[PDB]
Amino acid sequence: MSEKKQPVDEDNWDDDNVEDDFSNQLRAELEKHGYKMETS
Amino acid sequence: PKNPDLRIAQLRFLLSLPEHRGDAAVRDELMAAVRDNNMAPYYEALCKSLDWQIDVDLLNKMKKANEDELKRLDEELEDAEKNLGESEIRDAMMAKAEYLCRIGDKEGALTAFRKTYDKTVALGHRLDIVFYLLRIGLFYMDNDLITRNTEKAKSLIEEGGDWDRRNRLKVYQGLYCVAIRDFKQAAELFLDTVSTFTSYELMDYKTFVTYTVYVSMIALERPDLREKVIKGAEILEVLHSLPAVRQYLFSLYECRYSVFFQSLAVVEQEMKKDWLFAPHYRYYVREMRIHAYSQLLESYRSLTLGYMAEAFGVGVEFIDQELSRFIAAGRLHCKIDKVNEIVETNRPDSKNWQYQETIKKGDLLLNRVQKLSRVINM
Amino acid sequence: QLLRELKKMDDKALLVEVQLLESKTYHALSNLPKARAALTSARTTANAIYCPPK
């Protein structure tokens, strides 16, 4: 009963949520926020 | 029998973050590979770090020491097969065989795990095995064996009660938790810092204090926060050793703006140098941030970000994208503004936001049983 | 090392002659219950001795 069209056609798996904030963003985070002391 | 090659597993973590260098590898690589018959700490590092010029007078004298250790195994278990006692072979050879697992690979499985697991009923030898799957889940940085030792230890958690070592089970289950983003049970099970005084799987007990305070500074609400990290009696001395740790707590509880980031730079330096914590260096830092902004932003309602940037350091555009990501990330509900510049806060979830999760579960899980309800006829 | 010698010998005032100093230093590091225990040791010490020093 299982098929009918379709036979023709802890890890980081939970860390993926904030890793979506880690991959597109904030990879040099305290390399700029840590340099807010002396940049200005 | 645990802590030297566990420290060499910390040297594997020293191989982890400084990658560009091949000299700080080889120096204490040779220092850890000339001491105390350790074939595997240069064998896997032969598989990872620099290879060998030769090994004949260098380390085949230590495979010759391994040969000597092996021929006295062939002395010992053939001298213990005559004796008929407390499984003399498996006991007096699980000693040298956990030492063999210190020498070489996971053949310590067959010659330790079941070699003492098929005889005993006491949890001491099996718990040495659990601690050795812990140390080899520190060698290989396992996800497997540091769960398999829990799978083996819960076979004797079901009857127990013991003073130090079961609290150490709590400690390493918490290290398994906060080896990934699992955070509160680690601190809750570390919180009984008294009975964990010194056993020969510990590192510096003071560093155990630093690790429990790093994990207990968050997942601990402000009354519990002040009662534990402030009103803690015996904790105060073992954080009076390190000034910057007590400075970190009093700078966080002080709730300033720039000593937030000075303190946070100290714990930025500290958080990396930490094995099975340094690949988790990011959500802890913005977790400190989200706790700080959450305790600082509910109280005001006529708030300007000029009042922030006057005392954070610089935030005129520097905290702009920071707080914007923090708000639109799902949490830290306030409103960031155009140059009208009034930051507007929200409710304590006493009335409004509470009214969702009931139908959020009566949809999902009750809809799974709607499917099973529609399993009647066909 | 002071606990290695005095609690076996007889001079019970000479015990608290340093145990009370330890009750000071557990306030100096703010170890509150152990300083309470040291004060209790002082109180259960001083009822055997008349007053030969102050």
CSV table of N, CA and C in Angstrom, one decimal, chain B residues 176-251:
chain,number,residue,atom,x,y,z
B,176,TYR,N,29.2,15.5,28.8
B,176,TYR,CA,28.5,15.0,27.6
B,176,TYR,C,27.5,16.0,27.1
B,177,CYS,N,26.6,16.5,28.0
B,177,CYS,CA,25.6,17.5,27.7
B,177,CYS,C,26.3,18.7,27.1
B,178,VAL,N,27.1,19.4,27.9
B,178,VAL,CA,27.7,20.7,27.4
B,178,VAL,C,28.9,20.4,26.5
B,179,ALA,N,29.2,19.2,26.1
B,179,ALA,CA,30.0,19.0,24.9
B,179,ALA,C,29.3,19.4,23.6
B,180,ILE,N,27.9,19.4,23.6
B,180,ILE,CA,27.1,19.9,22.6
B,180,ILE,C,26.3,21.0,23.3
B,181,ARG,N,25.4,21.7,22.6
B,181,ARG,CA,24.5,22.7,23.2
B,181,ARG,C,23.5,22.1,24.1
B,182,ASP,N,23.9,21.6,25.2
B,182,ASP,CA,23.0,21.1,26.3
B,182,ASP,C,23.5,21.6,27.6
B,183,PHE,N,22.8,22.4,28.3
B,183,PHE,CA,23.5,23.4,29.1
B,183,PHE,C,23.1,23.3,30.6
B,184,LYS,N,21.8,23.1,30.9
B,184,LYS,CA,21.4,23.3,32.3
B,184,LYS,C,21.7,22.1,33.2
B,185,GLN,N,21.5,20.9,32.7
B,185,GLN,CA,21.7,19.7,33.5
B,185,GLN,C,23.1,19.5,33.9
B,186,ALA,N,24.1,20.0,33.0
B,186,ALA,CA,25.5,20.0,33.4
B,186,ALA,C,25.7,20.8,34.7
B,187,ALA,N,25.2,22.1,34.7
B,187,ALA,CA,25.4,22.9,35.9
B,187,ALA,C,24.7,22.4,37.1
B,188,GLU,N,23.5,21.8,36.9
B,188,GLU,CA,22.7,21.3,38.0
B,188,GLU,C,23.3,20.1,38.6
B,189,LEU,N,23.9,19.3,37.8
B,189,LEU,CA,24.6,18.1,38.3
B,189,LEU,C,26.0,18.4,38.8
B,190,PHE,N,26.6,19.5,38.4
B,190,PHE,CA,27.9,19.9,38.9
B,190,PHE,C,27.8,20.6,40.3
B,191,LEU,N,26.6,21.2,40.5
B,191,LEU,CA,26.4,22.1,41.6
B,191,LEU,C,26.8,21.6,43.0
B,192,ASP,N,26.8,20.3,43.2
B,192,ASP,CA,27.3,19.7,44.5
B,192,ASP,C,28.8,19.5,44.4
B,193,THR,N,29.5,20.7,44.5
B,193,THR,CA,30.9,20.7,44.3
B,193,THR,C,31.7,20.2,45.5
B,194,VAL,N,31.0,19.8,46.6
B,194,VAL,CA,31.8,19.4,47.8
B,194,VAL,C,32.4,18.1,47.6
B,195,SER,N,31.7,17.0,47.3
B,195,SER,CA,32.1,15.6,47.4
B,195,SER,C,33.0,15.2,46.2
B,196,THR,N,33.4,16.1,45.3
B,196,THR,CA,34.2,15.8,44.1
B,196,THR,C,35.6,16.2,44.4
B,197,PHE,N,36.1,16.0,45.6
B,197,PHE,CA,37.4,16.6,46.1
B,197,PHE,C,38.6,16.3,45.3
B,198,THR,N,39.0,15.0,45.2
B,198,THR,CA,40.1,14.6,44.4
B,198,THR,C,39.9,13.1,44.1
B,199,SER,N,39.8,12.7,42.9
B,199,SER,CA,40.0,11.4,42.4
B,199,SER,C,40.9,11.4,41.2
B,200,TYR,N,41.5,10.2,40.9
B,200,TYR,CA,42.6,10.1,40.0
B,200,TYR,C,42.1,10.1,38.5
B,201,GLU,N,40.9,10.6,38.3
B,201,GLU,CA,40.5,11.1,37.0
B,201,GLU,C,40.3,12.6,36.9
B,202,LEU,N,40.4,13.3,38.0
B,202,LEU,CA,40.3,14.7,38.0
B,202,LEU,C,41.6,15.3,37.4
B,203,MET,N,41.4,16.5,36.8
B,203,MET,CA,42.4,17.5,36.6
B,203,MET,C,42.4,18.4,37.8
B,204,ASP,N,42.9,19.6,37.7
B,204,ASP,CA,42.8,20.6,38.8
B,204,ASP,C,41.4,20.8,39.2
B,205,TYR,N,41.1,20.5,40.5
B,205,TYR,CA,39.8,20.7,41.1
B,205,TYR,C,39.4,22.2,41.0
B,206,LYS,N,40.3,23.1,41.1
B,206,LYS,CA,40.1,24.5,40.8
B,206,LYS,C,39.6,24.7,39.4
B,207,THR,N,40.1,24.0,38.4
B,207,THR,CA,39.6,24.1,37.1
B,207,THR,C,38.2,23.5,36.9
B,208,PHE,N,37.9,22.4,37.8
B,208,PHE,CA,36.5,22.0,37.9
B,208,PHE,C,35.6,23.0,38.4
B,209,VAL,N,36.1,23.9,39.3
B,209,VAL,CA,35.3,25.0,39.8
B,209,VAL,C,35.1,26.0,38.7
B,210,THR,N,36.1,26.3,37.9
B,210,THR,CA,36.0,27.2,36.8
B,210,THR,C,35.0,26.7,35.8
B,211,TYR,N,35.0,25.4,35.5
B,211,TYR,CA,34.1,24.8,34.5
B,211,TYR,C,32.6,24.8,35.1
B,212,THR,N,32.4,24.5,36.3
B,212,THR,CA,31.1,24.6,36.9
B,212,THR,C,30.6,26.0,37.0
B,213,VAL,N,31.5,27.0,37.2
B,213,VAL,CA,30.9,28.4,37.2
B,213,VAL,C,30.7,28.9,35.8
B,214,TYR,N,31.5,28.5,34.8
B,214,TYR,CA,31.2,28.9,33.5
B,214,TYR,C,29.9,28.3,33.0
B,215,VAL,N,29.5,27.1,33.4
B,215,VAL,CA,28.3,26.5,33.0
B,215,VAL,C,27.1,26.9,33.8
B,216,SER,N,27.4,27.4,35.1
B,216,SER,CA,26.3,27.8,36.0
B,216,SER,C,26.0,29.3,36.0
B,217,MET,N,26.8,30.1,35.3
B,217,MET,CA,26.5,31.5,35.2
B,217,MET,C,25.3,31.8,34.4
B,218,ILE,N,25.0,30.9,33.4
B,218,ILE,CA,23.7,31.0,32.7
B,218,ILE,C,23.0,29.7,33.0
B,219,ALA,N,21.8,29.5,32.6
B,219,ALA,CA,20.8,28.5,33.0
B,219,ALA,C,20.6,28.7,34.6
B,220,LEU,N,20.6,29.9,35.0
B,220,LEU,CA,20.4,30.2,36.5
B,220,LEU,C,19.9,31.6,36.6
B,221,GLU,N,18.6,31.7,36.9
B,221,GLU,CA,17.9,32.9,37.0
B,221,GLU,C,18.4,33.7,38.2
B,222,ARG,N,18.2,35.1,38.1
B,222,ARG,CA,18.9,36.0,39.0
B,222,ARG,C,18.8,35.8,40.5
B,223,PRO,N,17.6,35.3,41.0
B,223,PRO,CA,17.7,34.9,42.4
B,223,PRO,C,18.5,33.7,42.7
B,224,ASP,N,18.4,32.7,41.9
B,224,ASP,CA,19.3,31.5,41.9
B,224,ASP,C,20.7,31.9,41.6
B,225,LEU,N,20.9,32.8,40.6
B,225,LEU,CA,22.2,33.3,40.3
B,225,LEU,C,22.9,33.9,41.5
B,226,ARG,N,22.2,34.9,42.1
B,226,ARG,CA,22.9,35.5,43.3
B,226,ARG,C,23.1,34.5,44.4
B,227,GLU,N,22.1,33.6,44.7
B,227,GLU,CA,22.2,32.7,45.8
B,227,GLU,C,23.4,31.7,45.6
B,228,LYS,N,23.6,31.3,44.3
B,228,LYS,CA,24.7,30.3,44.1
B,228,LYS,C,26.0,31.0,43.9
B,229,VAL,N,26.1,31.9,43.0
B,229,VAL,CA,27.5,32.4,42.7
B,229,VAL,C,27.8,33.6,43.6
B,230,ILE,N,26.9,34.1,44.4
B,230,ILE,CA,27.2,35.2,45.3
B,230,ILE,C,27.1,34.7,46.7
B,231,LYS,N,26.0,34.1,47.1
B,231,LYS,CA,25.9,33.6,48.5
B,231,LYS,C,26.5,32.2,48.6
B,232,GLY,N,27.3,31.7,47.7
B,232,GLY,CA,27.9,30.4,47.8
B,232,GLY,C,29.1,30.5,48.8
B,233,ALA,N,29.0,29.6,49.8
B,233,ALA,CA,30.0,29.7,50.9
B,233,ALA,C,31.4,29.1,50.5
B,234,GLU,N,31.4,27.9,50.2
B,234,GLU,CA,32.7,27.3,49.8
B,234,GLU,C,33.2,27.6,48.4
B,235,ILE,N,32.3,28.1,47.6
B,235,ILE,CA,32.7,28.4,46.2
B,235,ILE,C,33.6,29.7,46.2
B,236,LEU,N,33.5,30.5,47.3
B,236,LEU,CA,34.1,31.8,47.2
B,236,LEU,C,35.6,31.8,47.3
B,237,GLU,N,36.2,30.8,47.9
B,237,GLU,CA,37.6,30.7,48.0
B,237,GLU,C,38.2,30.1,46.7
B,238,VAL,N,37.6,29.1,46.2
B,238,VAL,CA,38.1,28.5,44.9
B,238,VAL,C,37.7,29.4,43.7
B,239,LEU,N,37.0,30.5,43.9
B,239,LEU,CA,37.0,31.5,42.9
B,239,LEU,C,37.7,32.8,43.5
B,240,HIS,N,38.3,32.8,44.7
B,240,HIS,CA,39.2,33.8,45.2
B,240,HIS,C,40.6,33.5,44.7
B,241,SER,N,40.9,32.3,44.3
B,241,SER,CA,42.2,32.0,43.6
B,241,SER,C,42.3,32.9,42.4
B,242,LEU,N,41.4,32.6,41.4
B,242,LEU,CA,41.5,33.4,40.2
B,242,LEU,C,40.7,34.7,40.3
B,243,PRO,N,41.4,35.9,40.2
B,243,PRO,CA,40.7,37.1,40.3
B,243,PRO,C,39.7,37.4,39.2
B,244,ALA,N,40.1,37.1,37.9
B,244,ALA,CA,39.3,37.5,36.8
B,244,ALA,C,38.0,36.7,36.7
B,245,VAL,N,37.9,35.5,37.4
B,245,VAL,CA,36.6,34.8,37.5
B,245,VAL,C,35.6,35.5,38.4
B,246,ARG,N,36.1,35.8,39.6
B,246,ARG,CA,35.3,36.6,40.5
B,246,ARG,C,35.0,38.0,39.9
B,247,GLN,N,36.0,38.6,39.3
B,247,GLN,CA,35.8,39.8,38.5
B,247,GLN,C,34.7,39.7,37.4
B,248,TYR,N,34.7,38.5,36.8
B,248,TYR,CA,33.7,38.2,35.7
B,248,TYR,C,32.3,38.2,36.3
B,249,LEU,N,32.2,37.5,37.4
B,249,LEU,CA,30.9,37.4,38.0
B,249,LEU,C,30.4,38.7,38.6
B,250,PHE,N,31.3,39.5,39.2
B,250,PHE,CA,30.8,40.7,39.8
B,250,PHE,C,30.7,41.8,38.7
B,251,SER,N,31.4,41.7,37.6
B,251,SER,CA,31.1,42.5,36.5
B,251,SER,C,29.8,42.2,35.8
